[PDB]
Write a protein that binds this ligand. Sequence first.
Ligand code: HEM
Ligand code: HEM
Ligand SMILES: CNCc1ccc(-c2cncc(CCc3cc(C)cc(N)n3)c2)cc1
Ligand SMILES: CNCc1ccc(-c2cncc(CCc3cc(C)cc(N)n3)c2)cc1
Ligand SMILES: C[C@H](O)[C@H](O)[C@H]1CNc2nc(N)[nH]c(=O)c2N1
Ligand SMILES: C[C@H](O)[C@H](O)[C@H]1CNc2nc(N)[nH]c(=O)c2N1
Ligand SMILES: [Zn+2]
Lengths: 407, 411
Amino acid sequence: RFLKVKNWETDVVLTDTLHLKSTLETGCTEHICMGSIMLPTKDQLFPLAKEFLDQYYSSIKRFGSKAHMDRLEEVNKEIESTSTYQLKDTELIYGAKHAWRNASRCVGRIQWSKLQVFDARDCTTAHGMFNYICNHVKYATNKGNLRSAITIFPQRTDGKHDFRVWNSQLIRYAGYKQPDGSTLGDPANVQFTEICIQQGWKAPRGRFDVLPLLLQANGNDPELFQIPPELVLEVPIRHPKFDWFKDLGLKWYGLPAVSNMLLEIGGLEFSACPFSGWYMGTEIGVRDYCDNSRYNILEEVAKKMDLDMRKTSSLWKDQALVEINIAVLYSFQSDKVTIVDHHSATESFIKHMENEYRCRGGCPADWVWIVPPMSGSITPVFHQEMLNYRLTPSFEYQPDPWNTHVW
Amino acid sequence: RFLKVKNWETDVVLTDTLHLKSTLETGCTEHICMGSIMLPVRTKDQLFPLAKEFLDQYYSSIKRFGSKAHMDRLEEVNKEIESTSTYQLKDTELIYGAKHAWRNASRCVGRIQWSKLQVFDARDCTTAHGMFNYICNHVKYATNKGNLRSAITIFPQRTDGKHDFRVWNSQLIRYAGYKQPDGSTLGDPANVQFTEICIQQGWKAPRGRFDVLPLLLQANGNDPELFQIPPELVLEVPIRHPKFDWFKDLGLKWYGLPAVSNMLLEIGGLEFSACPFSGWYMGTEIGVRDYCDNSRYNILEEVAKKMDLDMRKTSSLWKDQALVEINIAVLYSFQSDKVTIVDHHSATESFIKHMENEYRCRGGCPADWVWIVPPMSGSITPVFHQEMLNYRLTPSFEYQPDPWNTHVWKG
Ligand code: HEM
Ligand code: HEM
Ligand SMILES: CNCc1ccc(-c2cncc(CCc3cc(C)cc(N)n3)c2)cc1
Ligand SMILES: CNCc1ccc(-c2cncc(CCc3cc(C)cc(N)n3)c2)cc1
Ligand SMILES: C[C@H](O)[C@H](O)[C@H]1CNc2nc(N)[nH]c(=O)c2N1
Ligand SMILES: C[C@H](O)[C@H](O)[C@H]1CNc2nc(N)[nH]c(=O)c2N1
Ligand SMILES: [Zn+2]
């Protein structure tokens, strides 16, 4: 019941007591571990609200106080009456920051308390959504000095009036299936790109076309908007030693901004809550550029390096992988756009874990996602035991809109 | 119940039914996952059903389930348990059990080879000297002059837990570690404590950076005894780099034969506390973990120095760059000396084929993603994108406590 986690590189042992406050389920049982699986009413609402308000008032050292009991009272009344309730600005900011704090798959959580929360609950139309999102993008980008931010749109009511951003990320590149049979641009976005076209987009059918926003307000049919190009900061990718690297024509966007998740706070559901931080290098260089189901450029780069691609045991893939990731970091740094390498980011996370164990009694963590997709065991997180569990407030996955939307 | 796993690179979906045959616990609950945790005297009472379950599995596999031979054997084992409080496996059952323990090892990426295992029955062994002989023969057989062959040697099963056979070495072949007065370490830092035990037991340490440790062998619950493996039986490989001529001057070598000797083999409820087994290396075990872990030989610095990489900013990825060259050298060196080794690309590709095969013919393949994905270049290998279910089947290999913590010394 009081669990220990060991670091096998440093022999340091931490005791987790925070997991006892876990509410949601893991997918695992005593018979089977699903640790590597990607996706494993009035009555219900009040205890959820209560649990949240309890931890909120605890956090501001006013547990069991007049203000605490009064607020509990007021929300209890509002639920009984309106079948839902509205968060105070203070509770919203707290809940959003803690949703990030609780994101067990996020390596960047040392920054959790420095989140800019944009309250967009007064939004009523897709054009308003577009305005709010442009402002978010401009604020977060900050001319390359990236700042964490989240924009929170109205909460779900009867499920028939959902606000949704249909894009998976605010900024991503289009994908087109070729008559050649191959794929132009980002293969991961072919389906979404078609929906844009099926909704009326005018695709420039290029390799790095920034997708339009598909925004859905109040359960209405979604609408298309183009983000002002001058708000999308991009970085041309070059290598500090290989001059030929630029001729690959590679670039990527500066702002990683997830827009398809659901923010749960005190039982309330925010179906549209785009949030953003800044990249860890490997997200671009390892996953985006080198996955076989993505831009898959390993072979092209290896060839330019004149490596022996006869035998896998020459580790040509590995050698090119490193150089690509060198170039990404180099390119971002040179253009003064915030980025963190996997060594720095994972070192930060260990320090954050130790902070969380000390001041909170634990830190939920998903090793499968926290360990970088290259060079894993030379980062300190590899040797760090982690316990994974689900605390609320939380970011949750939700069904893709097109599979749900009643047109 | 049915369980699906998805490969996110290929969209291949597989259905697991084998997990229904799972008995042991995982450590996880509905409220916590312990998937990244390293480590999460038996009465006749609990022994009959474990024996029965195993023999049902055995006779099913040979297509003789429910036969008179099956029924006679159950009867025979039953009587033997209630008479003697234990029982003995037939040779056929032992071989089956050992192969299936490997087949079931959810942390092992090399399992495509599970059916080709050489099983050495040492259940007639009675002394440490006899253990030494059996282990020498295993090492010679497995090594096969560099053409490695998988093998396992099985010493007598536990009885009352007061007469255990144990190999005190974690692996049959390993280098000594010496903690210096100034706090530095000579040799392999992982083996400092075991080295000290050996020294206390009378081992004369050469005190070099690559001294092969003596065997410390315990038979029938007696105090362990020291034995030196004949050097001519210990195949080693000098590490050099195909393009970097200064790499040889680092003075590195490694042994060819990975042989785990501290685990417990469970078969039909019986416990084999000494069951050394060996295969061949995947490159990264040596080049990533053995050489580059901060808690091991830790040579990233010197290699990066000699490469003249920019070492002031970690964002130069000088650590990653050095790591790759070292792993190139390890593979190159083994291949050049014709000692069996497999790169992490080949090994993970084979495991996926194995896994898919197992789903089709067996209804599953328990696998621990945390261990299966290699310690470098994870997502450019096919296993990274593969969803896996982890559960525990028997026969199995299990961890057991270090013997120096539990042994009652005779004197
Ligand atoms: C500011 C610097 C940040 C860094 C360096 C960072 C880093 C990462 C990385 C590398 C991942 C793995 C995701 C993948 O590989 O696809 C991740 C996941 C995640 N991050 Fe963070 N992140 C940052 C900011 C944030 C912020 C501001 C939030 C929320 C307010 C957040 C919430 C999450 C969540 C919920 C996941 C899981 C995503 C999923 O399941 O798809 N992150 N992060
Ligand atoms: C024949 C080629 C083999 C290869 C390439 C291979 C590969 C590996 C690797 C890379 C690991 C992880 C090692 C680590 O990082 O500590 C491992 C673990 C393991 N292997 Fe295999 N192995 C092979 C043979 C065998 C054999 C013959 C057996 C048993 C008969 C076996 C049983 C296991 C077990 C039980 C583990 C888990 C170790 C632990 O929990 O500490 N393997 N294997
Ligand atoms: C085959 N899979 C392709 C694919 C899968 C998942 C994703 C993805 C989708 N949504 C979110 C992410 C998380 C990335 C992220 C988010 C944030 C806030 C910061 C950061 N550094 N990185 C990743 C992209 C592409
Ligand atoms: C971190 N302390 C050093 C260390 C600790 C444990 C191990 C280790 C422990 N148990 C099992 C292993 C398996 C290694 C292996 C075994 C076999 C049969 C084949 C193979 N290729 N590799 C390795 C190695 C090194
Ligand atoms: C804490 C964590 O589970 C530990 O470092 C694991 C990670 N994955 C591993 N994978 C392999 N093959 N071998 C290991 O020793 C480890 N160590
Ligand atoms: C199947 C496996 O869980 C899947 O490939 C995971 C592994 N680890 C990951 N880790 C991160 N950070 N992001 C991912 O998308 C994944 N994918
Ligand atoms: Zn689990």
